Design a protein around this nucleic acid. Structure first.
Lengths: 45, 217, 146, 99
RNA sequence: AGAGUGUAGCUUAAAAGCACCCAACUUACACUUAGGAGAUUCAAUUGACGCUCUGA
């Protein structure tokens, strides 16, 4: 039941690209985050 | 009017990983991404590529590629956590890391004298105390470990009636945070059971009415 | 007419209770009606903080449609300004140079009036069962200022 | 004082000459229409499933409450009300890859 | 084993009116617009395939 709020869409009129970037927390888990600049790994200390 | 005091304790475990994705949802995500691309405008990467290539061509007729190559290299070097966890075991059914996609309910097998079925861990309450207190006490004694069973409310779930002297069963659920089960090699038949396995294990009607209020997902 | 049997037929303000009060600055919240055999909690405050904005907006829309279809009154749902955070990055062979990154963080707030024990527990178990990936729930109190 | 954040920045009006055109075809439009119809049907099915599950849970809770009331005219006064425990309640979302 | 039953979630309706979701506006709710899926369980007022209750 976690796919009801997955297929989303930016309802704003003027906006830039939001590439599905991944981020790992202080344990070891990725998450698809819609953010600019097509990065691949975000090492957040 | 004699009434035998019993109860019940059903465990609720939140899922860790999400359910698998269907092809129609994949096509829907693809078309939504295409619509997002067609609606988006003036991005940082788009400019940093286009105007940079234009400046390169201009100063050559008289960055971005290496950056994305380094990004791809860092993505290929870093290996994510292997989601394959429900297929590499296929034997340790009483483990916490068995199923991590759905909800899991715990039950303990106990063979009595007149009854020989697989009943959910009951909870005997006393008139001198309350009901939720006795329920959580029985849950802590039958678990012999350090767990955090956060109850979602004082209201019950489902009740039954069996006689031979009357009796009654009080169902109580509690959300589990972390799993610090001490000594997983106990002789108690406490197995982490989900939904289909739960419906397949039970047999009588007293347990068939439990799968109607649990989170079927 | 007052004496005719058709008296009081054009009355209409008795069927409404909206007296057009100043609800923009009024801080009068309903208390938790406690009695024992009939429990009723006041106004809560659900928080859906995450790193993505569209996911939070979709979750807020979903929960608002759900609480609208479940026949429960809704106070007001607003949004707080985002907080920019920098992500320092240290160089590999040089643990002395630091960099910086940019990421977003949004949060939504929804409130529900009547929450009886059974109804509220069913609502919260449905919310936690259908909790999407990314966002997180952290219900607080109604005394959260901005 | 709430600070508005949905206001678009000033860098969203000086540049707007990149991808103004959108080209498609009749096949793409009919495929998108079929996909939207299938997704609407799937959402309706999921909504009906959630509705019947909620109805089943509600009727089970009502049966349990009425049985507890008819079997004990005292435990209902302490079982209906809720003790102060879910005030700082929190539930973090699921994960993708295990630690 | 007995009883109550019988048009999708509803009908002192006989294949309709209320309901649901998706796409556009909205911080959000909501109106509106543009669309979709829905039923008389069987053989001629009768008997039996589905649900509930009373039991063991």
């Amino acid at each position: 039941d976690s796919s009801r709020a997955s297929l989303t869409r930016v309802h704003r009129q003027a906006y830039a690209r939001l590439y599905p970037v991944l981020l790992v927390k202080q344990d070891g888990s990725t998450i698809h985050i819609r953010y600019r600049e097509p990065r691949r790994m975000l090492a957040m200390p | 009017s004699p009434w035998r005091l019993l109860g019940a304790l059903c465990l609720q475990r939140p899922p860790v990983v999400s359910k698998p994705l269907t092809p129609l949802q994949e096509e829907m995500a693809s078309l939504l991404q295409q619509i997002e691309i067609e609606r988006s405008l003036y991005s940082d990467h788009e400019l940093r590529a286009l105007d940079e290539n234009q400046r390169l061509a201009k100063k050559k007729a008289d960055l971005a590629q290496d950056l994305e190559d380094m990004w791809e290299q860092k993505f290929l070097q870093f290996k994510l956590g292997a989601r394959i966890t429900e297929a590499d075991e296929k034997n340790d059914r009483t483990s916490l890391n068995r199923k991590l996609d759905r909800n899991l309910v715990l039950l303990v097998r106990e063979k009595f004298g007149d009854q020989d079925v697989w009943i959910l861990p009951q909870a005997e309450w006393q008139p001198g105390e309350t009901l939720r207190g006795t329920a959580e006490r029985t849950l802590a004694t039958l678990s012999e470990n350090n767990m955090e069973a956060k109850f979602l409310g004082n209201a019950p779930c489902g009740h039954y009636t069996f006689k031979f002297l009357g009796a009654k069963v009080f169902f109580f659920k509690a959300l589990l945070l972390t799993g610090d089960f001490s000594q997983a090699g106990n002789k108690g038949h406490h197995v982490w059971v989900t939904k289909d396995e739960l419906g397949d294990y039970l047999k009588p009607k007293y347990l068939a009415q439990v799968r109607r209020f649990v989170s079927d997902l | 007419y007052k004496t005719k049997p058709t008296h009081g037929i054009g009355k209409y303000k008795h069927l409404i209770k909206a007296e057009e009060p100043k609800k923009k600055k009024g801080k009068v919240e309903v208390r938790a009606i406690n009695l024992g055999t009939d429990y009723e909690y006041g106004v809560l405050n659900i928080h859906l903080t995450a790193y993505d904005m569209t996911l939070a907006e979709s979750y807020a829309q979903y929960v608002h449609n759900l609480c609208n279809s479940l026949s429960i009154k809704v106070e007001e749902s607003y949004a707080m300004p985002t907080k920019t955070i920098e992500v320092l990055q240290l160089q590999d062979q040089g643990s002395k140079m630091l960099l910086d990154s940019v990421l977003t963080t949004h949060e939504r707030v929804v409130q529900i009036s009547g929450l009886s024990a059974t109804f509220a527990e069913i609502f919260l178990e449905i919310i936690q069962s259908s909790l999407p990936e990314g966002v997180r729930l952290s219900v607080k109190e109604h005394t959260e200022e901005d | 004082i709430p600070i508005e954040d949905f206001i678009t920045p000033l860098k969203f009006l000086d540049k707007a000459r990149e991808r103004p055109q959108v080209e498609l075809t009749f096949e793409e439009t009919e495929r998108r229409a079929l996909l939207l119809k299938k997704w609407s049907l799937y959402k309706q099915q999921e909504r009906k499933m959630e509705r019947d599950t909620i109805r089943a849970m509600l009727e089970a809770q009502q049966e349990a409450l009425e049985e507890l009331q008819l079997e004990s005219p005292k435990l209902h006064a302490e079982a209906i009300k809720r003790d102060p425990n879910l005030f700082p309640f929190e539930k973090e979302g699921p994960h993708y890859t295990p630690p």
